Amino acid sequence: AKLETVTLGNIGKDGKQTLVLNPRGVNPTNGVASLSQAGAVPALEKRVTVSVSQPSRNRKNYKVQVKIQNPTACTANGSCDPSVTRQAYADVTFSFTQYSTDEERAFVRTELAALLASPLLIDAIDQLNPAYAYGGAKLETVTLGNIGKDGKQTLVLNPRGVNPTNGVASLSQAGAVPALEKRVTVSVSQPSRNRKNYKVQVKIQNPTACTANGSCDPSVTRQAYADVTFSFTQYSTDEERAFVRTELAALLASPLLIDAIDQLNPAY
Numbered sequence: 001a002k003l004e005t006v007t008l009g010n011i012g013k014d015g016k017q018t019l020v021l022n023p024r025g026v027n028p029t030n031g032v033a034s035l036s037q038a039g040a041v042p043a044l045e046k047r048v049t050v051s052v053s054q055p056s057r058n059r060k061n062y063k064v065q066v067k068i069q070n071p072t073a074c075t076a077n078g079s080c081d082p083s084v085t086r087q088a089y090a091d092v093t094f095s096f097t098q099y100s101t102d103e104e105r106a107f108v109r110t111e112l113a114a115l116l117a118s119p120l121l122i123d124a125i126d127q128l129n130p131a132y133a134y135g136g137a138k139l140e141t142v143t144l145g146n147i148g149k150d151g152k153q154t155l156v157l158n159p160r161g162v163n164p165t166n167g168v169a170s171l172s173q174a175g176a177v178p179a180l181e182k183r184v185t186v187s188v189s190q191p192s193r194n195r196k197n198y199k200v201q202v203k204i205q206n207p208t209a210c211t212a213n214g215s216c217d218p219s220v221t222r223q224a225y226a227d228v229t230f231s232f233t234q235y236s237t238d239e240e241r242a243f244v245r246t247e248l249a250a251l252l253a254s255p256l257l258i259d260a261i262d263q264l265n266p267a268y
Contacts, residue, residue: 001265006026008250013126013242021048026268029148033267043084050257052266055098059110062264064094066251070244072236088232090244094261095225100103102262108204108226109261110147113154113252115202118142120186125200125230125245127213130188131169132162142171157184179220182206192234200230
């Protein structure tokens with residue numbers, strides 16, 4: 001509910017870098033909290049924005065929006081002062097209903113945090129090897145330990161094939177009815193021609209079943225939709241990319257996003 005200074009450790013490939021995000025206050029025009037570093041020039045600032053949207057007459061859902069930027073400073077050979085040659089965005093969005101409790105919300109946040117540490121994405125984010133690749137990705141049953149509210153749940157996502165039409169992968173639960181699978185899709189498809197950038201997309205589809213006396217057959221409710229999208233350009237090194245992925249994992253364990261996700265409190 002109240003902003004503080006957020007400190008994230010073991011960031012990067014080596015897990016030795018550390019980031020301190022000083023809060024820069026809550027913009028009340030669009031209700032977006034903002035956190036940045038201290039670098040005394042606004043261009044060279046790693047910015048993190050968190051916003052929580054109430055359900056409206058149009059939206060009719062809860063929606064949490066997390067964006068993060070990471071500019072890169074060059075020498076600027078002719079000039080004296082350094083400029084921003086490129087920046088690496090990353091955007092996370094969540095979707096929930098009012099009937100969705102916190103434990104489903106806390107499940108998604110912890111599953112997403114453990115998913116970024118998984119060997120599938122660190123091949124997909126750093127090396128840019130898509131899941132849709134005989135020799136690019138392992139494409140094996142990913143086990144996600146210690147997720148949940150108390151961190152005592154474990155998830156195994158079985159690879160239910162790769163769709164070549166959209167290029168996306170699919171990592172589903174090992175359940176029976178196809179409407180009840182907790183299917184996670186990773187799309188590392190990289191259109192470098194029209195977008196001139198690299199897009200990585202993950203959807204933690206996390207459906208929920210609660211039905212009785214409906215002819216003794218369960219029905220999907222809410223579905224706990226979640227989405228993550230990365231944006232990198234050419235010439236961006238993988239350590240710049242691995243810096244983004246690792247600090248995204250650190251924010252999902254951060255107390256500023258615990259109450260923002262679980263209790264849905266906008267941290268003013």
